[PDB]
Amino acid sequence: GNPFEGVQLWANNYYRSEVHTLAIPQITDPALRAAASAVAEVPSFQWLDRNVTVDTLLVQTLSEIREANQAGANPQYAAQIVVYDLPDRDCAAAASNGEWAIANNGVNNYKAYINRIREILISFSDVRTILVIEPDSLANMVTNMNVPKCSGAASTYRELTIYALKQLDLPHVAMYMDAGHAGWLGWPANIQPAAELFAKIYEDAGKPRAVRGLATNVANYNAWSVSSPPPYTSPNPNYDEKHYIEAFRPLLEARGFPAQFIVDQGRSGKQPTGQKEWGHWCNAIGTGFGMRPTANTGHQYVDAFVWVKPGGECDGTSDTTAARYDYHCGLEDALKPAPEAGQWFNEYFIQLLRNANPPF
Ligand SMILES: *[C@@H]1O[C@H](CO)[C@@H](O)[C@H](O)[C@H]1NC(C)=O
Numbered sequence: 349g350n351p352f353e354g355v356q357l358w359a360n361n362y363y364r365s366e367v368h369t370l371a372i373p374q375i376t377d378p379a380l381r382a383a384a385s386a387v388a389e390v391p392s393f394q395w396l397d398r399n400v401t402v403d404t405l406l407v408q409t410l411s412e413i414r415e416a417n418q419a420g421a422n423p424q425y426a427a428q429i430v431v432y433d434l435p436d437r438d439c440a441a442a443a444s445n446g447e448w449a450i451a452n453n454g455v456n457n458y459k460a461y462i463n464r465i466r467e468i469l470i471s472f473s474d475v476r477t478i479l480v481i482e483p484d485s486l487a488n489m490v491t492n493m494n495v496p497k498c499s500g501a502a503s504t505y506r507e508l509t510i511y512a513l514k515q516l517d518l519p520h521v522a523m524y525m526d527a528g529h530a531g532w533l534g535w536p537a538n539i540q541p542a543a544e545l546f547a548k549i550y551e552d553a554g555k556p557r558a559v560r561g562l563a564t565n566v567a568n569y570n571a572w573s574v575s576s577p578p579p580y581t582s583p584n585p586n587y588d589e590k591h592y593i594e595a596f597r598p599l600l601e602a603r604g605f606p607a608q609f610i611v612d613q614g615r616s617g618k619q620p621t622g623q624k625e626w627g628h629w630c631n632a633i634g635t636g637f638g639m640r641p642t643a644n645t646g647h648q649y650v651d652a653f654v655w656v657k658p659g660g661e662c663d664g665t666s667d668t669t670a671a672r673y674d675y676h677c678g679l680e681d682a683l684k685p686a687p688e689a690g691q692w693f694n695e696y697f698i699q700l701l702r703n704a705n706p707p708f
């Protein structure tokens with residue numbers, strides 16, 4: 349029942365165009381150019397991180413995949429999409445690019461967004477669609493409830509996640525709820541509380557057929573599996589995603605949720621990274637493209653290794669005077685200067701390409 353099995357993952361035209369038009373022209377090394385062409389074809393997720401993407405990007409991606417499939421793709425292509433617009437988004441962050449607020453009709457705005465997405469998915473029932481549900485949402489309920497915006501948002505995040513899990517429970521869809529990463533929920537003291545939270549949400553949503561499990565390391569740089577713990581992970585015993593998931597799954601399964609995982613490895617190629625501290629998530633230096641997306645992970649609990657955050661697209665501006673500035677993007681281990689979040693960051697793309705592992 350692995351949704352990644354028996355299909356090819358669609359490598360979208362937006363990311364392809366960014367590499368061909370923004371990156372390649374500026375690369376002098378012939379070897380780096382050839383590798384950039386290859387990276388352009390690696391299928392990464394696309395994000396519905398703003399309401400305007402629903403009637404644009406989403407429809408365009410599904411339309412393009414249908415056309416490719418109707419022309420004979422074999423195996424058929426499947427879509428990889430991130431749902432990321434909860435109101436009062438990123439409750440514990442220093443800065444957030446979310447557009448809606450709970451105190452200003454955010455629940456009704458989010459329900460309508462989920463409803464329109466559902467309508468579009470129903471209209472593309474011939475396109476297998478894999479979704480990552482809301483990164484940096486429920487992981488905050490495990491450890492960041494001391495932050496007032498997070499304790500104030502908790503019930504809404506729970507209710508709206510349940511709403512999304514049921515409304516997007518469609519026969520051709522597979523959903524993975526975000527579950528932070530080893531350096532967030534993988535610490536031994538956070539494992540069980542996290543397992544209690546995710547298994548209860550699953551149960552409370554009626555164990556929807558489409559809910560396949562959880563996604564980890566989204567937009568982070570952790571290794572899947574390395575023999576030695578990177579210094580900035582100490583003293584966490586679960587220093588990589590394999591350690592985190594091997595400890596987490598049994599607790600989830602005992603509580604009624606035999607969650608299968610997908611793990612982001614888009615920026616996990618070079619280990620250790622250049623991060624000075626594990627919580628430094630913005631445009632981290634000393635990182636490289638990691639294992640390519642695949643359904644053949646060699647691990648019973650992991651449906652696939654994926655590229656969720658498209659390496660080369662910025663995490664946030666380093667301009668300290670900008671409205672959306674997050675201080676994490678101005679730290680010593682964040683590559684600067686950096687453009688606005690989501691915009692092509694060619695200097696970062698080149699870094700990832702040079703540090704790729706395995707190499708392209
Ligand atoms: C979200 O976009 C939809 C169209 O996809 C539009 O009808 C709706 O008004 C938007 N929601 C808000 C709160 O602006």
Ligand SMILES: *[C@H]1O[C@H](CO)[C@@H](O)[C@H](O)[C@@H]1O
Pocket residue numbers: 375376377
């Ligand atoms: C292509 O050429 C230029 C000039 O030597 C370098 O800046 C680059 O690193 C690459 O070798």
Ligand SMILES: [Mg+2]
Pocket residue numbers: none
């Ligand atoms: Mg083992």
